[PDB]
Amino acid sequence: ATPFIFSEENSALEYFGEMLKAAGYNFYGTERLYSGISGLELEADIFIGVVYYQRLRHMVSDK
């Protein structure tokens, strides 16, 4: 994810959507979910992925 490595001509979304479509998923990164409460396939297909979360040092236990 180095800055300034992907231009307007070579886009990042194009690159990673091709990567995804090469794995059987869809270009735009949306997979369609079901509702865990009603059990029905939601009408909109959701955008899901893997992101890196940090946990901050500020906790309600200290404030």
Binding site: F4, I5, F6, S7, N10, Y15, E18, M19, A22, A23, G24, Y25
Partner: protein, 51 residues
């Protein structure tokens, strides 16, 4: 027998030592530009549906 002022100098020479410029080649980088991130060949799907 003493020292007296003589005629004013007619000119001055100032010497300095200087080397010269080479040709402009402008060789910017060993491996140049920002080389683009790219597709691994073939890849293949690493996942299948159930059924």
């Amino acid at each position: 027998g003493g020292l007296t002022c003589a005629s004013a100098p007619q000119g001055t020479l100032r010497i300095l030592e200087g080397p010269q410029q080479s040709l402009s080649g402008s060789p910017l980088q060993p491996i140049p530009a920002s080389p683009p991130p790219q597709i691994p060949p073939g890849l293949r799907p690493r996942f299948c549906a159930f059924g």
